[model samples]
Target chain A: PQITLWKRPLVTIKIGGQLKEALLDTGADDTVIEEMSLPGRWKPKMIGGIGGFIKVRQYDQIIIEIAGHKAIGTVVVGPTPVNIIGRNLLTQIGATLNF
Target chain B: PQITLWKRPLVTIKIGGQLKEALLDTGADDTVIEEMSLPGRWKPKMIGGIGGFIKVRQYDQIIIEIAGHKAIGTVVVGPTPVNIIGRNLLTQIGATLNF
Candidate 1:
């Protein structure tokens, strides 16, 4: 499947059996979700962005579904300004940048 | 040419006759550049993102080059943490999000 670029490439994603809208952020290295509940244990971590650094809970082996495509990887829950789907899971779902 | 999704989609962009690395951000609606000098008059505007909102100088009719592709559009200059190439220019370069 292919998605056209919009003013914002937003998509629906399912994480921890919950659905949410997330921006498809190719610039991000890790998937960052706004504060959310998770089923398993996680480690405390910090991530830096344009603004500064923020604390997050790094949860591994989490299932993320985007447009019916499923991938298991790391998900960070924190006080993120927005929900972002980064390249970690994007690559897993065979996403590419085409010109 | 096509680019594979990296952990971060960092690319070189040329603006105001100067070259800089910018994140290929599909999530951003407008291109945001770190404080830089520009020619011509601009209007002041505010843009909001994950963290919050920031003041920007909106400059129009500026020539931007990415990967040897040329595009002319509005570019916002301010104290951005990173340089982001948004959809305005990406569409001009025929960039698309594919899976």
Candidate 2:
């Protein structure tokens, strides 16, 4: 599916059997999700953003469904303006940017 | 052109007669560039990001050449992790997300 950038490129995502919405952010190095409990031993991590580095939890091998496509990768749970499906997971889903 | 998510979607953009590299960021609401002087009266503004919000300078009617495509719109200059060509300008080039 081709998504126009006229509006936010947000899509439905499923994680840990839960449904959520996230933006397909090409600028982010990692996929950042809202702070939620995921069964796993997450490590404390700091990620770079607009205002600077922020502390977050890094959960590895997390299974996620992006626009119906299954993907597994590192998920950073933190405080973001919005949930984002970044390059780390976007690569797993074979997503692309087209012009 | 189709850009795989295997790497950051950075491209060359010409602005104010200067060429710079910018990431095609679908997650960002507005285009944010490195602190550069753009001639004209710019309005002070603040925008949200991964960590929080940051102050920026908004220059409207700015001309940008994105991956060889010509575009004109609002451009924000501030302290950013990287030069981001966000939705505001991606729409101008008819760029899209595909899977």
Candidate 3:
């Protein structure tokens, strides 16, 4: 799949059978989603970004679909300003930066 | 040029004749740099990230070199957790998200 840069590179993704919009962040090491309900048990963790840090629930081995490409990885659900699809899942989908 | 995603998709960028490492953040709307001296006319602005927002000095017409590709765009410099190359400049270099 190919994703081109628009005004902002936003994408639609399906997580836990729910569809949502997410930013493809190559800068982030892990995926962070808005606080949501999940069936699996999760552990508490913290992630830092440009401004500060926030508490998160780390759910492991979650399946996420981006542009019809499926990727299995860890996703942290928390009080994030926006939903972010990071390098963890991007790498799994063979995502690259091309110019 | 093609850039493969590593553990973290970090790249070296040259800004204001100084080379520094920056995260190629597709999630970020504007390129942000740590507090530095830039020789140009700039204005005050703010940018929000995952956690919160921060005040920044928005410098226009700055030349940035990433992976030997030169891109001219706006750059915001201020106190940030990390340096980020956002979509503004990425789009200028014909960067795309591919899998």
| Highest-scoring model, DockQ | 2
Model 2 lDDT tens row, B1-99:
999988888899999899999888898889999999998989999998877888999999999999999999999999887899989889988898888
Model 2 chain A poorest ten-residue lDDT run: A76-85
Q: Which stretches of candidate 1 lie above 4 Å from their native place?
A: none
**Chain A of candidate 2 compared with the true chain A, TM-score:** 0.96
Candidate order by DockQ, decreasing, is 2, 3, 1
Residue-level error in angstroms, candidate 1, position A31: 0.8
TM-scores of all candidate predictions against the true structure: 0.92, 0.97, 0.94
> Candidate 1 local accuracy as lDDT?
0.86
Candidate 2 per-residue lDDT, tens place, A1-99, comes to 989988888899999888999999888889999988898899999899888888999999988999999998899998887899999988888888988
Quote the positional error of residue B97 for candidate 3 in Å: 0.7
Residue pairs in clash, model 2: none
The CAPRI-style docking tier of model 2 reads high
- Which runs of model 3 end up more than 4 angstroms from their true locations? none
Over A1-99, each residue of candidate 1 has an lDDT whose tens digit, in order, gives 666775678889999879999988787788999988998889999887655578899999999998779988999999888899988898898888888
**TM-score of the B chain in each candidate versus the native B chain:** 0.94, 0.96, 0.92
How well does each candidate reproduce the native contacts, as fnat? 0.67, 0.93, 0.86
